[PDB]
Amino acid sequence: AKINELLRESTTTNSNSIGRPNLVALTRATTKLIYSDIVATQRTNQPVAAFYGIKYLNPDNEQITELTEESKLTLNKGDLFKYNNIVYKVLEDTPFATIEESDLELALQIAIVLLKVRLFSDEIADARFQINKWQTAVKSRKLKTGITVELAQDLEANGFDAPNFLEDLLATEMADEINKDILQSLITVSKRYKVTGITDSGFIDLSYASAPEAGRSLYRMVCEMVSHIQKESTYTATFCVASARAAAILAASGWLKHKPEDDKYLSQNAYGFLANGLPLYCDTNSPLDYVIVGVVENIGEKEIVGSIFYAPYTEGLDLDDPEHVGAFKVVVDPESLQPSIGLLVRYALSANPYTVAKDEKEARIIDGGDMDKMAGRSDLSVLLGVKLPK
C-alpha cells in the first residue's frame, strides 16, 4: 500500500542503492508547494550545510572626490569624482555651470549627455563583490500527523474519488511548515524602510487617511522599494511578499493580476503577477499586513544572492528516477497505542552571517541561523509594515 511503501522506502538511507518511487513522487508533490523562488537554495547532503553568498558595500574611506551639492562647484577640467559607486571624469573647466537643474543626480545625468563629464574606467581593481562561506546545522523537523497507519491504509481503498490524496495531504503539511519557516525568517531578517523619520512617524499608515481605492498608495510604495534595492545593490528585486489583506484585495485592484497570460511564466505558488512585473507571494497566515521586496539571483546554476539560504537535505538522486530524495521522509509515530504517521523533514535554513559579522574571525562566533542576531540586517530584502481598515 502507498503508506507502507512510503515507510519502508523512508527507512533506507542513501537513495542510490534502491529506487524509491513513492518518495520521489511525494518529493515532487512537496517541492511544488514550497516557495523556493523566494530563497537562495543550495542543496546539501551533510548534517551541516555549506552556504555561499556574495555581497558588497561602498568602500574608500588619488583620493577620488565624492560628489556633493557644494562639491560640484569646485570641480575643474581633469578632476576625477564619483557618485553612487560610479567614478566620472571632467572634460571641461568648472561644469554644472550652464546646467540649471537643482537636483544633484539629475544635474549629473544631463551633465553626462552634454559631454561635460564622462564615466571613467582607464592597473589593478579592488573587489566589487565578496563570496562568503559559512555553515549551519541542518535541522530535523518531526511532524506528528495524528493519522494512524490504519486509516492511511483504508484511505487508499476508500478513495476512488481522490486517488493520491495521501500524497497531497503530506506534501501539503511539509510544504506549509517550511513555507512558514521561510516567511517567518524573511519577516525577521529583512530590513525596514527609512523614508524621513522611519517612514514618516511610524511605518506608513494607509487606513484612516485612505479611501477603499485600488490601493495605488501601496503599489507606489512597492516600486520605491524595488528602486531603493538596486540603489543600494545593483541586482534588481525578483520577488514580493505581502499580507493576505495587503495583497489578496488591496493591491488586487488593477495592480495585481492572478496570472497575466495563460502560462506567461509564473509559479502557481505565486498569488499574482504585479503591475510592475515581479511576482508576489501571499503570506495569508501572518498577522502583520506588511510587504517585503527581495531578490534571489544566481551566478551559473548556483543561487548565491539571497536574504535567506535554503538547504534541503538530500540522500542523493533516486537513480532510477532523477530526483534528490532525502529532505522529506515518512516514519512511524512511536508515541501512540495505534501506530500513527510521522513526517521527517530535514533541511538547513540560514541567513548570511556576514550581514553583521565584519571580520572573517567574527563569523565563527555568530551563527546565520541565529535568528536573534540576523534580525534586522539583510539588505537583499525589505519589509514594510501596513495599517489597513476593516
Is 366 in contact with 373 (CB distance < 8 Å)? yes
Residue 381 Cα distances to 142, 228, 296, 320, 323, angstroms: 29, 10, 9, 39, 30
Q: Which residue, among 39, 33, 34, has the nearest Cα to 51 in the 3D structure?
A: 39
Is 35 in contact with 294 (CB distance < 8 Å)? no
Distance, CA of 14 to CA of 316 (rounded, Å): 6
Dihedral angle sign, alpha carbons of residues 42, 45, 49, 54: negative
For residue 46, how many other CB atoms are within 10 A of its CB? Answer: 13
Is 50 in contact with 135 (CB distance < 8 Å)? yes
In this structure, what DSSP letter does residue 230 have? H
Is 215 in contact with 248 (CB distance < 8 Å)? no
Domain topology for 62-122: Seminal Fluid Protein  PDC-109 (Domain B) (2.10.10)
- The experimental method, as deposited, was X-ray
3-state secondary structure of 173: helix
DSSP string across 87-152: EEEE-SSS-SSS----SHHHHHHHHHHTTSEEE--------S---EEEEEEPEEEEEEEEEETTHH
Q: Which residue, among 379, 387, 390, 58, has the nearest Cα to 199 in the 3D structure?
A: 387
Is 173 in contact with 35 (CB distance < 8 Å)? no
Element housing 217 (H / E): helix 216-232
Dihedral angle sign, alpha carbons of residues 181, 184, 189, 193: positive
- What is the grid cell recorded at 146? 495524528
Element housing 31 (H / E): helix 21-31
Name the one residue in this structure whose C-alpha cell is 534502491.
18
For residue 257, how many other CB atoms are within 10 A of its CB? Answer: 12
- What is the grid cell recorded at 337? 497505542
Name the one residue in this structure whose C-alpha cell is 519557516.
181
Distance, CA of 71 to CA of 112 (rounded, Å): 17
Nominal resolution in Å?
Answer: 2.9
Q: Which residue, among 310, 299, 307, has the nearest Cα to 346 in the 3D structure?
A: 310
Distance, CA of 131 to CA of 129 (rounded, Å): 7
Q: The CATH number of 191-295+375-390 is which of 3.30.2320.40, 3.40.50.11260, 1.10.10.10, 2.40.37.10?
A: 3.30.2320.40
- For the chain, what is the largest distance between any 2 Cα atoms, rounded to a whole number of angstroms? 88
- Sort 228 into a burial class: Cβ within 10 Å, 0-12 / 13-18 / 19+: middle
**Residue ranges per structural domain of the chain:** 1-61+123-190+296-373, 62-122, 191-295+375-390
Buried b (16+ CB within 10 A) or exposed e, 83-113: beeebbebebeebbeeeeeeebeebbeebee
- What is the grid cell recorded at 247? 495583497
Query: Radius of gyration over alpha carbons of the chain, in Å?
Result: 26
User: What are the phi and psi torsion angles at 235 (to 5°)?
Assistant: -140, -30
Distance, CA of 378 to CA of 3 (rounded, Å): 42
- List CB contacts of 145: < 8 A, sequence separation 6 or more: 170, 173, 333, 340, 341, 342, 343
- List CB contacts of 30: < 8 A, sequence separation 6 or more: 170, 171, 174, 175, 327, 328
